[PDB]
Design a protein around this ligand. Structure first.
Ligand code: CL
Ligand code: CL
Ligand code: CL
Ligand code: CL
Ligand code: CL
Length: 408
């Protein structure tokens, strides 16, 4: 599903710049709200509260809604486009670009300013000549690219493709200690046990180096607070409403554990590789099957018949000779084996995990998915060819075993 990924300039910059609903202080000391909407230059806080109330037409106490931040953002986009169209170095390139690549260019102005963007003289001519691949390579040769790697990558991919796909799943990579530093800063505990994120003077020198490193990546801001998008990722993993928790065994090599977590409308993928954690904030348009596929990769479905009239562990103790030899090789010697359980959080702070699990098998004959069923009080198992549709079916069945019976 979701073969045409729909983005827009506001969601793009919400992710890259970060949406702040509370008055904020950038590095230069200026008070800011929304997506980098400058409130005042004054070194004073109260001046900022005055200016914010004027722009909103409401007494706000330094707190706005997402809709209000979008209003301010639209004015800033106009101001940035107005500036671009009056800059002889940027107007020709902007006029030639499609709407998506225009948003990528507006994205850069938001970050480094109209003059800084005009300094990419080589890349700007490549974009005007529709040499997408060359511009993408050239842009990566800037200090901008290394200063903010995750943002520049997405913007450069957007310049290359002219699509929104770079924002379907946006990822950050942190060490287990960096994750603990973020959680400590955000008042977060109760992470999925499957990720193994567990809680003086020696710890302080260790974390002050990690904090310095996170600041260098733009994961922590100038006062040591996380980027709002990273904050969103880590928060979603703390006390999620739903999770898929997976154990992933790879014949080609240690078991990898990863999680898909939902909290309200946010989805986060968390893969742990040793002492490394990869977090991905996932756009609502993506489906559960797509999130799992993002971790496991694509594979050709194994041309097999269904094998659902199977009781629990009876599978492991009326098929064809051919259909029997295929299935035997799949389970006996699989290239890869994933088991996925699901959980849900209850209002009272407790959680339920399924006992049954959905399965994904890769082999020389193609991928296979295993769908769990509780019928008449006994656990059933059904093997199906591993298409993204059947994977979604296996995950739907798994989730239906939760007290709520749905992912919502
Ligand atoms: Cl350049
Ligand atoms: Cl090119
Ligand atoms: Cl970044
Ligand atoms: Cl900052
Ligand atoms: Cl169960």
């Amino acid at each position: 599903e979701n073969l045409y990924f729909q983005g827009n300039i506001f969601e793009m910059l919400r992710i890259d710049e970060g949406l702040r609903l509370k008055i904020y202080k950038d590095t230069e000391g200026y008070y800011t709200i929304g997506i980098g909407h400058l409130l005042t230059k004054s070194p004073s806080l109260n001046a900022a509260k005055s200016e914010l109330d004027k722009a909103i037409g409401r007494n706000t106490n330094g707190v706005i809604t997402k809709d209000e931040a979008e209003k301010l953002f639209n004015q800033d986009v106009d101001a940035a486009v107005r500036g671009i169209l009056r800059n002889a170095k940027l107007k020709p390139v902007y006029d030639s670009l499609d709407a998506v690549r225009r948003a990528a260019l507006i994205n850069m102005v938001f970050q480094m300013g109209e003059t800084g963007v005009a300094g990419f003289t080589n890349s700007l001519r490549m974009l005007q000549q529709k040499r997408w691949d060359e511009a993408a390579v050239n842009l990566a040769k800037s200090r901008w690219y290394n200063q903010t790697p995750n943002r520049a990558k997405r913007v450069i991919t957007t310049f290359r493709t002219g699509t929104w796909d770079a924002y379907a799943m946006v990822g950050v990579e942190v060490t287990i200690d960096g994750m603990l530093v973020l959680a400590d800063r955000l008042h977060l505990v109760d992470f999925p046990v499957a990720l193994g994120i567990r809680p003086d003077d020696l710890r302080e020198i260790v974390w002050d180096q990690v904090r310095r490193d996170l600041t260098a990546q733009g994961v922590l801001d100038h006062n040591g607070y996380p980027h709002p998008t990273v904050a969103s990722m880590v928060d979603t993993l703390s006390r999620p409403d739903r999770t898929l928790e997976a154990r992933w065994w790879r014949r080609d090599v240690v078991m990898v554990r990863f999680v898909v977590a939902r909290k309200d409308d946010r989805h986060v993928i968390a893969v742990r590789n040793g002492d490394l954690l990869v977090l991905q904030l996932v756009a609502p348009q993506v489906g559960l099957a797509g999130m799992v596929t993002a971790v496991l990769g694509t594979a050709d479905p194994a041309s097999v018949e269904p094998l659902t009239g199977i009781a629990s562990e009876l599978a492991e103790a009326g098929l064809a000779p051919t259909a029997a030899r295929i299935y035997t090789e799949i389970v006996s010697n699989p290239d890869s084996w994933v088991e996925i359980v699901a959980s849900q959080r209850h209002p009272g702070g407790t959680t339920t995990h399924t006992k049954a699990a959905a399965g994904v098998l890769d082999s020389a004959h193609g991928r296979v998915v295993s769908l769990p069923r509780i019928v008449s009080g006994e656990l059933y198992g059904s093997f199906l060819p591993g298409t993204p549709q059947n994977l979604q079916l296996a995950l739907d069945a798994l989730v239906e075993l939760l007290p709520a019976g749905s992912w919502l």
